[PDB]
Swiss-Prot record:
The chain holds residues 69 to 361 of 361 of the full protein. GO terms for cellular component: mitochondrial intermembrane space; mitochondrial matrix; mitochondrion. The record marks 47 as: Transition state stabilizer. Its EC number is 1.11.1.5. The active site is at 51 (proton acceptor), 190 (tryptophan radical intermediate). CCP1 precursor is processed by the rhomboid protease PCP1, which cleaves the N-terminal hydrophobic transit peptide. The m-AAA protease (composed of YTA12/RCA1 and YTA10/AFG3) is required for CCP1 maturation: m-AAA protease promotes membrane dislocation of the CCP1 transmembrane segment within the transit peptide to ensure the correct positioning of CCP1 within the membrane bilayer, allowing intramembrane cleavage by PCP1. It catalyses: 2 Fe(II)-[cytochrome c] + H2O2 + 2 H(+) = 2 Fe(III)-[cytochrome c] + 2 H2O. This is Cytochrome c peroxidase, mitochondrial. Destroys radicals which are normally produced within the cells and which are toxic to biological systems. The modification Phosphotyrosine is found at residue 152. Forms a one-to-one complex with cytochrome c. Transmembrane segments: none annotated. GO terms for molecular function: cytochrome-c peroxidase activity; heme binding; metal ion binding; peroxidase activity. Belongs to the peroxidase family. Cytochrome c peroxidase subfamily.
Length: 293
């Protein structure tokens, strides 16, 4: 059984150091507001954090956030990762200012920072991801297909040790951003507020009038009269009776959805990492707004 990946704190660093990195990311989020027709870089950094963590296989502990392997061509050229190069470019000048942070820690922190700055829940975050060599890069094809049903989604996420509630909560990130026809074969914003984190993914599934249409890439997606879109895999969460209960739950309780997302998101970003008994506790970073910055 599995590789063991032990978190090792960047030498001599503590909370204040990582807050500084969070702050640099958050300040650039605010400065580079123009990206994607004023959506900005928040959604793409969340997706980058998810895709670099979502390669994890619980059976042998390959993939995962630990190794920061997205920096290698095999993984950055994963067709599943198309468009994430923009997030990597965003983070370039951050990594240059703080060259002491590991790539794993930077990608996952990017995602925490974007969620919190887009007014989502606090996500405790732990340091100590260590860059691993190019031969540790997971092969392509570990991230999920969008054209599939609820049974697919349930089985898919068992590999990442997520249960129904964790799956439904994580999928609420599709409040954020949009599909881009050239990136994935799907096109259109997921919701109304593309760069504000809310439970609107659940309210939209339940409340909008959805039509199954073919987009310009000849792929089926669900389109609402409002101008939103959901993937077949999104919509499957209201087709499956067990998912649909959880959807209705988060639709009706913003705070529960926040708490559940934070835990599931932290878990996702931490799968495969052994934290020593003596490792520091998880950091909860203040937002710029909380700091008066
Ligand atoms: C069955 C599971 C999932 C599937 C099939 C899926 C698939 C997709 C696809 C095809 C796109 C559009 C990519 C593009 O064209 O730009 C997308 C966007 C996005 N996904 Fe997911 N996703 C899944 C779960 C997740 C999770 C678990 C998260 C994070 C918690 C997440 C975060 C995002 C974000 C933020 C975007 C917007 C990216 C942007 O606006 O640039 N997704 N997803």
């Amino acid at each position: 059984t599995p590789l063991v990946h032990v978190a090792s704190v960047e030498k001599g660093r503590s909370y204040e150091d990582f807050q500084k990195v969070y702050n640099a990311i958050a300040l650039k989020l605010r400065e580079d507001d123009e990206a994607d027709n004023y959506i900005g870089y928040g959604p793409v950094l969340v997706r980058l954090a998810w895709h670099t963590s979502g390669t994890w296989d619980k059976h042998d502990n390959t993939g995962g956030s630990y190794g920061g392997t997205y920096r290698f061509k095999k993984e950055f050229n994963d067709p599943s990762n198309a468009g994430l190069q923009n997030g990597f470019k965003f983070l370039e000048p951050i990594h240059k200012e703080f060259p002491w942070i590991s790539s794993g820690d930077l990608f996952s922190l990017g995602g925490v920072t974007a969620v919190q700055e887009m007014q989502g829940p606090k996500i405790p975050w732990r340091c100590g991801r260590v860059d691993t060599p190019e031969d540790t890069t997971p092969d392509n094809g570990r991230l999920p297909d969008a054209d599939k049903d609820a049974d697919y989604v349930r089985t898919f996420f068992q590999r990442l040790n997520m249960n129904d509630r964790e799956v439904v909560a994580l999928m609420g990130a599709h409040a954020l951003g949009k599909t881009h026809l050239k990136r994935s074969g799907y096109e259109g914003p997921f919701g109304a507020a593309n760069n504000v984190f809310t439970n609107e993914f659940y309210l939209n599934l339940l409340n909008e009038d959805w039509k199954l249409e073919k987009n310009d890439a000849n792929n089926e997606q669900w389109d609402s009269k409002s101008g939103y879109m959901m993937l077949p895999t999104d919509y499957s969460l209201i087709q499956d009776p067990k998912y649909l209960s959880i959807v209705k739950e988060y639709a009706n309780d913003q705070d529960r959805f926040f708490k559940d997302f934070s835990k599931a998101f932290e878990k996702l970003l931490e799968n495969g990492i052994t934290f020593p008994k003596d490792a520091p506790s998880p950091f909860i970073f203040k937002t710029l707004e909380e700091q008066g910055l």
